[PDB]
Every structure is written in C-alpha cells, then in structure tokens.
Amino acid sequence: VVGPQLKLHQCGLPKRMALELFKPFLLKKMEEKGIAPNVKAARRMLERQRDIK
Amino acid sequence: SPVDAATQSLLSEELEKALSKLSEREAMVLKLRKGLIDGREHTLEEVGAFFGVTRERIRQIENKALRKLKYHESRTRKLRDFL
Amino acid sequence: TSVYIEDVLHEFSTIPGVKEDVVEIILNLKELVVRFLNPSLQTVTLLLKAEGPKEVKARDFLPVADVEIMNPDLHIATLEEGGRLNMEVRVDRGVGYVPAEKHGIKDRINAIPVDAVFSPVRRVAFQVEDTRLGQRTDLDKLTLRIWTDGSVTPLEALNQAVEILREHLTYFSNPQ
Amino acid sequence: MEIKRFGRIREVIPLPPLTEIQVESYRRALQADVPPEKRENVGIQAAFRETFPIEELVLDFLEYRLGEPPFPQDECREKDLTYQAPLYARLQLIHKDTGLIKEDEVFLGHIPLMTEDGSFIINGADRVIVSQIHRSPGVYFTPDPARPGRYIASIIPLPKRGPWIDLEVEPNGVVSMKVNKRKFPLVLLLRVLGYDQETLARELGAYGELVQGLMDESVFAMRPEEALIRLFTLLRPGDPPKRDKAVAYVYGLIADPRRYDLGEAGRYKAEEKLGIRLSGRTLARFEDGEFKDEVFLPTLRYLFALTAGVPGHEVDDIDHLGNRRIRTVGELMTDQFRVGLARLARGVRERMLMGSEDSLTPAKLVNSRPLEAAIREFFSRSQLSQFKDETNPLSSLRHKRRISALGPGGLTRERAGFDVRDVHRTHYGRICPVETPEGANIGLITSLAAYARVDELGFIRTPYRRVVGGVVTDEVVYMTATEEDRYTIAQANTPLEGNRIAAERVVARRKGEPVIVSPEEVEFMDVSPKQVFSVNTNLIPFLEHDDANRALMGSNMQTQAVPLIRAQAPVVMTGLEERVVRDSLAALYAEEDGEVAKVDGNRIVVRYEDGRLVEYPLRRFYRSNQGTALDQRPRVVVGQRVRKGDLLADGPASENGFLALGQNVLVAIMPFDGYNFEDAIVISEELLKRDFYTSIHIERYEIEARDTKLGPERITRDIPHLSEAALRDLDEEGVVRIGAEVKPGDILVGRTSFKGESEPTPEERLLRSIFGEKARDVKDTSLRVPPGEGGIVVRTVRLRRGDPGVELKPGVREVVRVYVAQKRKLQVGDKLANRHGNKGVVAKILPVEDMPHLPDGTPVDVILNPLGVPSRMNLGQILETHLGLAGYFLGQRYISPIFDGAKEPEIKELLAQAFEVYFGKRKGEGFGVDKREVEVLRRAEKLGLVTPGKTPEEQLKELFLQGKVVLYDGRTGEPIEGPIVVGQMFIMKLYHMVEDKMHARSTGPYSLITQQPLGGKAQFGGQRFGEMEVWALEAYGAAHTLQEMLTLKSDDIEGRNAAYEAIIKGEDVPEPSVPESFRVLVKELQALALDVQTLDEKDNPVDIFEGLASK
RNA sequence: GGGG
DNA sequence: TATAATGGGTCTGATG
DNA sequence: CATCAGAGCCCCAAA
C-alpha cells in the first residue's frame, strides 16, 4: 500500500509481521526488561493472541 | 527444530546447575535411577552394587537430593515453564 | 453497543418466525437514536418482548426512566404467527466511532458486540456569503447548518464544539 | 424506484438458458428420463452399442437403467460423498455353441449426476466440467510450407479414436501417405481396396502429371491380398505377414468402428467437403469378402484437383469456427465411459476362455472396477474437472460457460502458439473477444457468447434475423461459422422504420469483413449487440467507450466480487443483471400464482392457486468453495399476492432480483495527497460505519482421531499441562462451544496422542521427578487456530465410528469439523474494482471530517485518481459517473444497453434536471451563492469551462452539465481550486483481502530431504529466495547477507540452530557451516558412481561429513 | 486454475 | 505337483 | 538429415 508520508529510507511494517519476523529478538528483550521472566515463558505468552500484552 | 535444540540445550544447562548444589554421589544416584548414564532406570537394587548401600540408604540418598533440589526451586524458579 | 437475544448464540443466527436475520436486526438496531435526560447516566439496558403477527417498531421497547426513543417508528423486525422476539440492548454514551471489534461489550455470555456510531451529528455544512458594514466591503457572513439525530440538539452541539475548541486553544499556554 | 432505460434496438429472441451448454449436454448423454426402447444411439447408449457384443461364448447388451441417488444433494456435500446414481445393465450370455442363455442385471457402479444449475458434487465439493475446444474431425487441405506449390491432405478423427493420416505428394509425382510417423507410396494401399489401373484413369483421369504419375507398375502386379501382405510388413518390422494377422490389424486400424471413429460431425464435414455419402463413421469397411473403400479416393481426387485451378477446391482455415468444435460435458464424460467399458470388455474376454465354458452367468463374468475407476478418474483428476468457482452467483455462471483449448485431447501450454489464441473473424457472435485471461493462458481459455448455442455436432451457432428485400422478419436462424459466410449480414443498429430497413446505406459483413452495402443486398441482420460478447462483458455499462485491455479486467473481476451484506445492484446497468440472477439459481421464484402463507428467516410457504401448500426452505449461510457466505434472504411478507415467476428470496450478491456484486458509492475523481498514488484508493470512514463493503466469510477446520500402534487418539477435554483459561470455551467432550469467539492460539478441538520411545528422555525424567508430577502418557495435539485466523464458531460436526449411518476411512475413529465465521469490514489492503478495469488497494481510510465534501455538507465516499484514466483509456467509468451524478439527486437507476445506451445529450438532459434539485432547493432555503464557489468559478472561467458574463447559477449549471462540481477540502474549508468530477460509481470488493495474504515466519517446518523451509502460508512456510533474488544480493555485493540466506536462514542445520540460540541470548549470530542441501548433492552424486571431493589448497581431501560417512 |  | 495347453497389446538450435 | 535439450519470477487454494 502507498505510504506518501514515509521518508525515502522507510517502510510501513505491520506490527503482526514484525512480531514473528523478529521473534527471537523480542524474546531476549522481554527477558531483559522483565515482561516475562525467562525466554521460554515469553514464547508461551506470544502463542495465544489474547495473552499478548 | 531450532526452538527445540534451544530448549534442550537450556534444560541441560539449568540442570547441571543442580549437580553442583547437591554433591558428587547424590547427583549420581539420580543419574542411575532416572537413566542419565545408561538410558535405562536402575532400581535401588542394582544401584546398591555401585556404592555398597542397600535399598533404603539409596532411598534417603535419592530423597535427600530431590527434597534439596525442591528447595532450590521456588528460589530460582527456572524449571517451572520447562514442560 | 451490545445485544442479547433469547436462544441466540452469535450474530450469524436466525430466529423462527422473524423475517429478518440477526445481522439485519443488529443493523436495524444500530440506527436507534436514544436520548438521555439525566446527564450523569452513562449506561442503560432497553428491554423488548413481542409475539404473534406484530411488526415490531422502536416503540415496543419497555419505557425506561430518563430515556426517550427519538425515532419510535423505526422498523425492527417482521414477525409472523408463532414468531417470538425478546432481547436486551445495551445503549452507551460515548464519542466518535468504536467498532465492535474494539469494545467487545458483553452483558451476558451470548451477548453480541455491536458497532457504535456515538456522534449525534448527522450532517454539517456552512455557507460563507458576501456582506458589508456599508463602510467596508468583502466581509463574510457565516451560516453554520447543523443537522442532528435529536439526542443532542444542533445548538448544544455548536456550544460543545466551541467549548472543545476554546479548551484546545488553552493548551498553547505553558511553553517549554 | 424509477428505472429509466435507454436504447432503440428491439431484441426479439432473448438469451437462451445460460447453463444449457452443461445441462443439455449431460441430459442428452445419459437419457435417464427416456424409456430405453425410445433411446437414440448417442452418449451412454452409443458407448454400450460400441463395446458390445463381446466375441470370445457371446455376451450381449440389452439396455441400461439409472437408479435414484443414494443421498440428496445436501447430504452429499455434508458427508463428503459423490452425488451419483446406480448404473445397471441387463446382459445375456448366449452360448454360440449350444444356445444356452443366462440373463441377469449387473451392477456397474455409480455415475455422478449433474445438479439443477449444471454443476457436480464430487466428494462433497462442487465441481464444473469446462467445455473443451478442439480441431473438428474431417478432411483438411493445408498448404505445404516447405514446398509452396504442393499441398497436404489430412484426415483427422475424434481424439484417441483413430490416427492422423497425411497424404504428402513427395518430390517425385506419385502421392505418399504418412501414418503413425511411417511413410510409403499410397499406391500400395489403393491396390488393397481392389483398385485396377483402369479405375484410376477412369475415375481420376485429367492430370497426366498426377493421374498417371501415381500409377506405378511394380505395385499393380499383385492381387488385393498380395499387396495387403506387402504393406503389413512395411509397418510392423517383426510380425509375420499372416493373412489373418494383417486383416486383423489393418481392419482395426482403419475400418473398425471400435478403434477408429470419425465423429458424427466428422462424417458430415467429410461428406460435404468431398460431395459424397459416407456409410459409416470410418475410412473403410469389410464387405462381402474384402475391403471396400469410402474416403481414400474422394480425398485423393480432391487433393489432385487442387494442384490445378479447379473450382470448389480451396484450402481450409483450421482456426475457422466451422472447423473447430466444442466438446461439452456429455461428450467429455462419455469418452471416459467408453474407455472404462473397453477395459471391462478386456476382462470379460479373459474370463470367457478360462473358467468353465458353460458354468458362467453374466454376474460373475463382469467386474465393474475398470469402469468405476475411469469414471471416478475423469471427475477427480481431469484437467477439465475444476473446483467450482462460486465466489458469487456470477462466478459459477461464468465458470460453466467457459471454453478451454487445453487438457486431454487438446493442446498444452508449451504446445500452443499464436494461431490458436488469436480472435478469429468467426468468433463474432460465438466466442466473446474480451473474456480471456491475462498471461500465459491468453486466448486458450474463453467464454461462450451470450446468444450462442452449441449444436448436436458441437459447432457454435449464433442467431441472425432474416432480411427479405428490405423487410426484417422476426424469424431467427442460428448459423455455423460456415453457413454465416454465405450471406451479407447487416449490423444490429441499422435504422428501422418498423420492420423496414430505413437507411440508404447499411453497415454489413461479408465473410467477417466490413462492407458498406445497400438494403437491397441485405440477407440477414444481427439480433443484438449482446450476441457478440460474453456474459460478464455484457455487464459493463458504456462498454463502447472502453479500451479492450481494460474491459477484459472488468469482465474477470466481476467473477471475484465478494458478496456483501448490504450489496446493491449498480445505478447504471446494462439489462442483464436480472437474467443472471435468474439463471444462476441463487434466488428463489414462484412456480405458479398464489398467495404467500408464512415467511421466516429459515423458510417461506406459498399457498398456490392449486390448493397445494409448498414450502421452500432457504439456503441459510452456507460456506462456498471459496468461503464466501451463500445466503438466501426472504423478499415477501405474510399474505402477499405473488404471480408466476415472482421473486420470493434474494440470493447472495442479489438485490430484489438484480445482480449486486458491490456497492454504489459517491466518488470524487481527484489526486489526494499521495494516498491516491499509482492506483491506490482512498475511502471515507463512513463506509465502515454503515457496514458498506462488509462481507461474511466462513472457514472450516477439520480434525481426525485415528487408531495408532501406540494407542488411540482421543477427542477429550483433559489436555495435559494446561490451564482452565485455555479450555474455557470447550464443551464436555472437548469441542469449542457454538458461539464462542476464537482467536489465534485458541483450542478448537482437544486431542491427545501417546508418545513413542520418546518416552521421556532422562533429563526430562529427572525434571519431572523433581517437580512432583510424573510424565504423562499422552501429549497435547489439539486443533488450534492458525496465525491470522479467527472468528465466531457457528457449527460443529462430529462423525464417529460406531454411530449410525457413518463409516470412516480405515483406521480413523472420529472426525470433527468446526466452522468459524468472521464478519469482514473493509480495511487497508483490501482490493476494490469497478466494471471498467479500474482496480486498486485501499491505501488510506480518512475520518469523515477529512473527506472532500460538497457545499451542502455531503462528504464523498471514494477518492479515485485521474491519472488512472488517460493511459488505460477506459472512459466508460467517466460516463458511468456522470449519469451516476444525475441519479443521485433525481433518485434514479438507469438501464443503458451496451452499444445502444444513453448518449451524451441524453445524459446532459438528466444532469440539468438534477441541477435543479441540487441548487434549486438552496436558493429558496435562504442561501445564495458561496464566496468560495465564486472563487472557483473565477478559475473555471480561466479554464474555458464556463461562459464569461453569466450569473453564478448559469455558470454552476454549466459545470454540472460537464459533471464537475464545487468541492471543499474538509481539512481547510477552502475549495479545491478547480471543479472536480463527482458522481456515483459501482465498485466491488474483490476476493483478494490482506487478511488472507499477510504472512510472516521466524522459524518453522523444514522439508524432509533438503532441510529447507516448507513453502506456503498454510504450512507456515518461508519465502522463496530464488535465483533472481540471489543475483540481486550479488549485484549489491552483499556477501554476508547472501551467505546468511544460503545457510543460517535455511538449511545450515548446525548454524541455523546456533543462530537462534545466539539471538535469544543476545550474542551476535555465529559464522555458518555447510548447508545440508549440499551434502544431499554430494550423496546424490555418489549414488551416480561419481566421486565428489572437497579439497584444501594442498589438494588434501576435506571431510564435510565430520567423520560420520567413513569407516 | 487465480494474483502481481 | 500330471487331460492339454508353446511369439504382446510446438519450436528452435546445436551436433554426428 | 536424426536426436537431444532448452523453453521468466514469486505467491495463493486445491489435493
């Protein structure tokens, strides 16, 4: 879809796609902040669309 | 898969965190009983022929390990999600 | 904002004796204009029950204190002999457009979230015509044309709009 | 409301039953509603009368009968069964030695039945048998390309019922014959018929170059049997010329109406072209003792006389629609029926000479299997058996009238060139010149013209009216492309004063080519402009103003219109939007006159005048093949006086009986800040508020619980290692409750399965014994919602082994199906389109306050971009908008016939009347003209749009007559500097929605041998980084990004596992190892005896197997 | 068999 | 394990 | 003049 408001170096990426595509990165960051206690629990959180905060 | 190889290599890591806090012979009766060494579960009978003990010091040797490891849980709370 | 119909589990259902489907009944309901008299009353819940060869209109809703159905002749559902309707619509005060996916308002278990067009303004237009204070020319005569549903009258809207506006100009006060 | 209709062409005969090409072909193929004695020798009957009798003991066929279907149509769709009928055949075993006759009726299996709308239900899935087009059987003369002067004769029979025979006249002056890729003097074959050198000069005689160049003396010096044994050796190196092995092979090859078959059409064609009478559909026969000829000399006589300049001799155009014919569903199926009947006859002869030559009934002598198979095969694996396109009623109607040149017996994608895909001048009136795919299939798949009908021989016919002198008759005449070529045919809109041709000069055709001729010389007139195009193309208003390349896209996208809940027929129609709903059988009408008794969302009841109370139940919310919701809503109320053929219920994409593929939105043609860029579309948030472009979609999820050598799977609710929050919407058995909102990850059906020698590995046993619990026997295998799916559960279906009337495939215990519905609103990414080829993806949804609005406060709905018009050259949408503008204020819908619709003057008249309603109310309502309307008029004046020196009223009307209006920006209140074209347009939401296409993967399933990721969204696949994408990274010199594509992110099992562990740990990815797909390459070369070696710089072998492959 |  | 049974069912370009 | 090897990419739902 056209994004006239984008800078030349930019694109619009659906947050749903970005989650799966960066999933490993997202797990490590979640553990480092505290949004979950260990990486394997964080993956359980993203598995049901409702459990996602 | 990568996720499985990941968790299987993180379960062994967070488990040999328990071979320490226990000891050397405690953290070995568990290896024979649960089959970490041979693959088969050796009863407190066969195990008696590797330390000399009979089928009731092995039980306390085992239950001292598990009960101690059970207190190392709820303080590290690592192994819960590992299902 | 929500609908429960007796012996109806989801929006894609059908009722014996009722010509309309539920998708249409919820569509007919969405056009209901409900005015509140008490200002501090946020939510209510209108009750309806009918049967036989009735052509249920918005009148048949059981009268609630401090609420008025502004369009009583609004067709709701055709019912033939044997057809029985019985529902509970939730009506909420709010702002703008909140799609059913966003609010998911459920009173009971089999409640069906409905799309909410909160805004009571149906159409707005304004005319700018040429005028004169006989001395000066090319002055403007502004004529605002507010249509509304009746829950809030065109004047109330105009005041609220001016108020939202002045309330916004105040934000330009403490700079940093 | 008022429906003004234009057009001055009086259409006599109306369109034929639009599905008859299917319905009639199959009813004629089967003849189940015809008493056996009265059956004609065609289709199923003709097959039996070709396979029988069976000559060992002589078995014979008497009659067949078709039984009633085991289950009703709905029950076949419901149970994944084939809607079919039992086929029996009364046979009698006549012992040609005693005379013993044992008779019996044998069960030959089931034949699939065609439903009322001309489709099929194969395994509970609706399917359509696409008609095939192929070269007609007959004799064809085509010029040699290597040798300009000589020609080639060809004798083509029906597909796989005879060999192609060519009669090239070699550089030598006697005529050769090329059959089965061999070649040999035709002189020898001619001797076998019994021809004597006198009958060659006597019958032929006139071309001493050829009549006498053909007669050779070494060949004539031998009897008909002496030559029959010479040629049997010239064609089978190895078989010994026996005089009962030669007459068996040649008769079967050329004279046997069982291996060779010129069709019924092939007969006529060959008779006419040569001016003879063919006794049988075959080139020769065996009568009285020897071979009597039928076709070989007529053909030779013609071919010779067309190496002179002799009259009537003319080459054939093999692309002429008089030489190509359609193979309808009946003929396509009957051909597979004749094949699965010749195999059953093979197994009959094998059982007839081993067993007990006297102890044989017909019952244990006939094994149905080879016939059940061939039939089952045509309907499940044929290229012409297609999953039905029932996106909307028009999808299926178009699918069934489609014509394909590919498939079994036709061409192949790579086997086809330019000549076959061209529009032939004879397509006119028969094959639509617009409807056809863009892309590889261009010209190979087409559509039957609207008034076109396939005849008994298989040729397409189109109607023409008879002109006699100058009077046009109501007499209609259907013609083939060969008949047509004999007449000067006038055009449909030739001026007519009553029944007389009013014009001095009329526009006609003579063999397709355009000629200006006088009314004296006119013989036939076109019946209508509708008879030249398809059904989809005939649905495009103002078609005459559109470029063909864009009219094609508008034709095809109508097939993709998703049915909407508030669907409505267009403001501008062509006058087919009713016959299409009627013939698609999606709506429901009155059988006779009467009054309506009851009306409900589920059923209608009609007290007919006959006293009989009929009850029509209504398809309510049924999932289609493409998942759109087919749904019939009632359109009459209790006690309504209904006449015959009156509408009782709208089908999907139907509004009061008119085809409703989309919505009538208020559109404004103007650039809009870039959100309009390169075909994207901008829409008002008001469309979502009134649920415009909202459609229901149903997805079906299915799960099996089967028996295993490890245990039984179980549909339980007792799933291990879970919480009650996850199981909250599951019932007692473990199936999600009807009416629950399911999202991705949610359990739909609980299922458990036992594990193997994966019986918890010690490090797991040690973990469980630590946590108190004990490893469970079974594991969670429940059916979950996939990423990006969801909705409301609307039906669950349980089928178990043991319950009455159900039996699953071997080993399967229970099968559960959960149907989930989702009400889909429009959203950014969804594709829209009009009937003219303008298509685009919604790029932006603006709140109503940003929409460009009219001066009286009315905001527009859609903002198309004018840049999409000039290059595309589809102006029909521009006229559609102008006439849509008038209809907006007059409150009218128009019927504007194709090539015979509203013309610009007429449109302007309506717009002027409409200007009174748009501006007339204003100037009495207490409002004059606006200041900014004047400013715009000042710029319109500079643009040559308005007349200088007129009042603002006269000037706004001048802009209104051009369709332009004053438009205010909603963000500023300032006017758009120029007057903008605004009006109502019919736009469809297409089946291509972002919810279907958005997909992303971190890691997932890998493929068995390559260890590369699976493909496809359904498999949770990876994207293909093909050859060209690798070239892209090479051209960038992005070496490491590419290496990661070829290892870590694909099949480097070591590196790809190590990469993931580094990213969850926060370490930079590791350096990759060897891709497993290269090891597969090395090992597959070793399998070919080739030794591949990976070496270092000292030419010492390097092991890429890490010692796992050596001993 | 559709999409680009 | 023993009547006798004996022969099947396109389209072009490069290279020998 | 015969035989063999080529004949665009990615994506979907189906099977």
Cα D599 from Cα D606, distance rounded (Å): 9
D595 close contact with C: CB closer than 8 A: no
Q: Closest by alpha carbon to D937, among D907, D957, D917?
A: D957
Distance CA(D843)–CA(D224), nearest Å, equals 81
Output the DSSP codes for D540-576: -TTGGGB-HHHHHHHHHHHTTBPP-TT-B--SEE-S-
Give the range of the structural domain holding residue C91, as residue numbers without chain letter.
Answer: 1-118
Sheet strands side by side (includes D695-708): D711-712, D695-708, D812-824, D791-800, D741-742
Q: How far apart are alpha carbons D486 and D913 in whole angstroms?
A: 50
Nearest alpha carbon to residue D253 among D157, D349, D141 = D157
| Shortest CA gap C130–chain D (Å) | 6
Enumerate residues 6+ apart whose C-beta is below 8 A from D392.
D559, D561, D562, D563, D628, D652, D653, D661
* Chain F bases having any atom below 7 Å from a protein CB: 7-11
The residue count for chain D: 1111
Nearest 5°: phi and psi at D66? -105, 130
C108: left (phi > 0), else alpha (psi -120 to 50), else beta?
A: beta
- The C-alpha atoms of residue C159 and residue D922 are separated, in whole angstroms, by 26
Eight-state DSSP code of residue D253 = I
CA D119, CA D629: separation in Å to the nearest integer?
18
Structure tokens at D717: 């609710």
Q: Is C81 on the interface with D (CB under 8 A)?
A: yes
What residue type is assigned to position B65 of the chain?
Answer: A
Residues across chain A: 53
- What are the tokens at D24? 């009639």
Burial class (CB in 10 A: 0-12, 13-18, 19+), B13: exposed
The H helix count followed by the E strand count for chain C is 3, 10
Given in angstroms, what resolution was this structure solved at? Answer: 3.0
Q: Which tokens in the block code for residue D673?
A: 């800040």
The reply to whether D536 has its C-beta less than 7 Å from any atom of strand E is no
Q: Using the beta-carbon criterion (under 8 Å), do B7 and A37 form an inter-chain contact?
A: no
DSSP states along D946-1011: S-TT--HHHHHHHHHHTTEE--B-TTTSPBPSS-EEEEEEEEEEBS--HHHH----SS--B-TTT-
- Strand G contact with D927 (CB < 7 A): no
Alpha-carbon distances, residue D1091 vs D305, D354, D1087, D1094 (angstroms)? 67, 55, 9, 10
How far, rounded to the nearest angstrom, does the alpha carbon of residue D83 sit from its chain's CA centroid?
Answer: 21
Half-sphere exposure of D484 (CA within 13 A, CB side): 28
Rounded CA separation D210/D149 (Å): 14
Q: Which residue is listed with tokens 């619509």?
A: C89
Q: Is the CB of D233 under 7 A from strand G?
A: no
Burial of D591 (0-12, 13-18, 19+ CB in 10 A): middle
Count the Cβ atoms, other than its own, within 10 Å of residue D303: 21
- Count the Cβ atoms, other than its own, within 10 Å of residue A30: 19
- Residue C17 C-alpha, separation from nearest chain D C-alpha, in angstroms: 5
Q: How many helices (H) and strands (E) does chain B have?
A: 5, 0
Find the farthest-apart pair of alpha carbons in chain C and give their distance in angstroms, rounded: 75
Distance D420 CA to F13 C1' (A): 24
Closest CA to D938 of D955, D954, D922, D923: D955
Q: What does the block give as tokens for B22?
A: 């226990």
Which residues are CB-neighbours of D643 under 8 A, at least 6 positions away? D590, D593
Q: Please tell me the distance from the alpha carbon of residue D269 to that of residue D325, in angstroms, as a whole number.
A: 12
What's the CA–C1' distance between D370 and F1, in Å? 35
- Closest residue by Cα to residue D806 from D75, D47, D8: D75
Distance CA B28, CA B30 (A): 5
C34, C69, C98, C116 from C44: Cα distances, Å: 10, 13, 18, 15
| Pick from A3, A17, A25: CB nearest D1063 | A25
- D181 is near strand G: CB distance < 7 Å: no
3-class state of residue D870 by DSSP: coil
Beta bridge mates, D411: D406
Q: Minimal CA–CA distance to C21: which of D742, D741, D618?
A: D618
Q: Is the CB of D1015 under 7 A from strand G?
A: yes
Nearest Cα residue to D630 out of D714, D678, D562, D693:
D562
Helix (H, G, I), strand (E, B) or coil at D43: helix
**For tokens 């994408």, what's the residue?**
D1029
Distance separating alpha carbons of residues D131 and D121, to the nearest angstrom? 17
C-alpha D370: how far from chain center: 29
Closest CA to C77 of C30, C21, C34: C21
Question: What CATH number is attached to the domain comprising D729?
Answer: 2.40.50.150
Angle at CA D1100, nearest 5°, toward D1098 and D1102? 120
D733 close to D715: Cβ distance less than 8 angstroms:
yes
Residue D793's domain spans which residues?
695-824
Q: Tokens 């295993």 correspond to what residue?
A: D708
Q: For chain E, which bases have at least one atom within 7 A of a protein Cβ?
A: 1-4
Give whole-number Cα distances, D827 to D287, D683, D941, D1038, in Å: 76, 10, 40, 37
Residue C48 gets which letter from DSSP?
E
Mutual orientation of helices D876-890 and D904-920 as an angle, nearest 10°? Answer: 40
CB environment D737-764: b (16+ within 10 A), e (fewer): ebbbbbebbbbbbbbbbbeeeeebbbeb
A4 reaches D (C-beta below 8 A): yes
CA angle D876, D881, D885 (to 5 degrees): 150
Q: Which residues is C49 bridged to in the sheet?
A: C86
Ranges of each domain in chain B: 1-81
C-alpha angle A42/A44/A45, rounded to 5°?
65
- Say whether D816 sits in a helix, a strand or coil: strand
CA of residue D1094 to C1' of nucleotide G5, angstroms: 30
Q: Can you give the distance from the CA of residue D383 to the C1' of nucleotide F14 in angstroms?
A: 35
Nearest to D677 among A2, A17, A20 (CB): A2
CB–CB contact B78 A41 (8 Å): no
What is the distance between the alpha carbons of residues D696 and D687, in angstroms, rounded to a whole number? 16
Q: Could you check: is the Cβ of residue D493 within 7 Å of any atom of nucleic acid strand E?
A: no
Query: Which of D763, D767, D1003 has its CB closest to that of B2?
Result: D1003
User: Under 8 Å CB-to-CB from D844, ≥6 apart: which residues?
Assistant: D672, D675, D680, D682, D683, D828
Instruction: Judge whether D1104 and D1082 are in contact, CB under 8 Å.
Output: yes
Neighbours of D987 (CB within 10 A): 29
Report the alpha-carbon distance of residue D341 to residue D346 in Å, rounded: 9
Q: How far apart are CA A9 and CA D1033, in angstroms?
A: 18
Give SS3 for D539. Answer: helix
B78/A40 Cβ within 8 A: no
Task: List residues of B whose CB lies inside 8 A of any D CB.
Answer: 1-3, 5-6, 8-9, 11-12, 15, 30-31, 34-36, 39, 41, 66, 69-70, 73, 79-80, 82-83
Residue D162 backbone zone (phi > 0: left; psi -120 to 50: alpha; other: beta): left
Task: Name residues whose C-beta falls within 8 Å of residue D1074's C-beta, 6 or more positions apart in sequence.
Answer: D1052, D1054, D1104
Nearest residue to D645 via CA among D594, D569, D580: D594
Separation of alpha carbons D160 and D342, rounded Å: 13
Q: Would you state the structure tokens that stand for residue C112, as one six-digit string?
A: 């069906």
B77, B78, B81 member nearest A44 (Cβ):
B81
Residue type, D1002: S
Token pair of B48, please?
């008696």
3-state secondary structure of A25: helix
> Are D and B touching by the rule of 3+ CB pairs within 8 Å?
yes
Query: Is D745 within 8 Å of A24 when comparing Cβ atoms?
Result: no
Q: Provide, as residue numbers in chain B, all residues whose Cβ is less than 8 Å from the Cβ of D764.
A: 11
In contact, D366 and D348? CB cutoff 8 Å: yes
**The tokens of D442 are what?**
């261009």
Give nucleotides in strand G with any atom < 7 A to a protein C-beta. Answer: 7-15
Question: How far is it, in rounded angstroms, from Cα D696 to Cα D562?
Answer: 9
DSSP letter at D851? S
Burial class (CB in 10 A: 0-12, 13-18, 19+), D448: buried
Instruction: Say how far apart CA D843 and CA D376 lie, in whole Å.
Output: 47
Q: Inform me whether the C-beta atom of residue A15 falls under 8 Å from chain D C-beta atoms.
A: no
Nearest-Cα residue of chain C relative to residue D824: C101
Residues from chain B contacting residue A37 (CB–CB below 8 Å): 77
Closest by CA to C157, choosing from C118, C127, C116, is C118
Nearest chain A residue (CA) to B2: A24
What is the 3-class SS of D180-196, one letter each residue? CCCCEEHHHHHHHHCCC
Q: What gap in Å lies between CA D437 and CA D777, rounded to an integer? A: 55
Q: What one-character-per-residue DSSP string does D1024-1058 give?
A: P--HHHHHHHHHHT-HHHHHHHHTTTTT-HHHHHH
User: Cα-atom radius of gyration of chain C, to the nearest Å?
Assistant: 22
DSSP annotation of D852: -
Contact call for residues D507 and D494 (beta carbons, < 8 A): yes
CB contact under 8 A, D738 and C140: no
The CATH number assigned to the domain with range B1-81 reads 1.10.10.10
Please count the helices (runs of H) and the strands (runs of E) in chain A. 3, 0
D881, D889, D957 from D877: Cα distances, Å = 6, 19, 22
- C-alpha to C-alpha distance for D88 and D110, rounded to whole angstroms: 9
The sign of the dihedral angle between the CA atoms of D31, D36, D40, D46 is: positive
D 237-266: CB within 7 Å of strand F? 238-240
Q: What's the rounded Cα separation, in Å, for the pair D348 and D359? A: 14
DSSP bridge partners of D61? D91
CA dist D563 and D696 (Å) reads: 8
E strand or H helix that includes residue D473: strand D471-479
Rounded Cα distance between D180 and D408, Å, is 19
Q: Which of D29, D124, D44 is nearest to D83 (CA)?
A: D124
What is the torsion angle, in degrees rounded to the nearest 10, for the CA atoms of residue D510, residue D515, residue D519 and residue D521?
-40
SS3 content of chain A, % helix, strand, coil (to 5): 45, 0, 55
CA–chain centroid gap for A53, Å, is 11
Q: Is the peptide bond before D53 cis (omega within 30 degrees of 0)?
A: yes
Q: How many CB pairs under 8 A join A and D?
A: 64
- Helix ranges restricted to H, D215-368: 217-220, 224-231, 246-250, 264-274, 296-305, 329-339, 342-351
Give the Cα separation of D949 and D496 in Å (integer): 44
Q: What is the DSSP secondary structure assignment for residue D11, as one 8-state letter?
A: -
- Using the beta-carbon criterion (under 8 Å), do B15 and D766 form an inter-chain contact? yes
Specify the DSSP class assigned to residue D242: -
CB-CB under 8 Å, C19 with D634: yes
Whole-number distance in Å between D1023 CA and G9 C1':
13
Asked if D798 and D774 touch (Cβ cutoff 8 Å), the reply is no
Measured CA to C1', the nucleotide nearest D440 is G8
Alpha-helical segments (H) within D129-194: 186-193
Q: Which of D721, D770, D776, D1073 to mutate to test the interface with B (most CBs of B within 10 A)?
A: D770
Chains in contact with A via at least 3 Cβ–Cβ pairs below 8 Å:
B, D
- Nearest residue for F5, CA–C1': D354
Task: From D742, D747, D758, D746, select the one nearest D718 (Cα to Cα).
Answer: D747
For chain A, what is the radius of gyration of the CA atoms?
14
Residue pair D831/D992 in contact (Cβ under 8 Å)? The answer is: yes
Sign of the four-CA dihedral D379, D380, D383, D387: positive
Give dist(CA D485, CA D467) in Å, integer. 16
CA C93 to C1' F14 (Å) is 82
Q: List beta partners, residue D712.
A: D707
**Cβ atoms within 10 A of the Cβ of A39, count?**
21
CB D67 within 8 A of CB D86: yes
Between CA D677 and CA D672 the distance in angstroms is 8
| Helix D952-961 vs helix D904-920: crossing angle, to nearest 10 | 140
- Half-sphere exposure in the Cβ direction for D974 (13 Å, CA): 3
The sign of the dihedral angle between the CA atoms of D352, D357, D361, D364 is: negative
Q: CA D160 to CA D158: how far, in whole Å? A: 6
| Cβ contact D460:D431 at 8 Å | yes
> Mutation test of the interface with chain C: which of D931, D934, D966, D972, choosing the one with the most C Cβ atoms within 10 A?
D931
CB D1077 within 8 A of CB D1051: yes
Alpha-carbon span D652 to D619, nearest angstrom: 10
Whichever domain contains C55, its CATH number is 2.170.120.12
Cα angle D610-D616-D617, degrees, rounded to a multiple of 5: 160
The Cα D829–Cα D86 span in angstroms is 49
Give CA–CA dist D302/D300, Å, rounded. 5
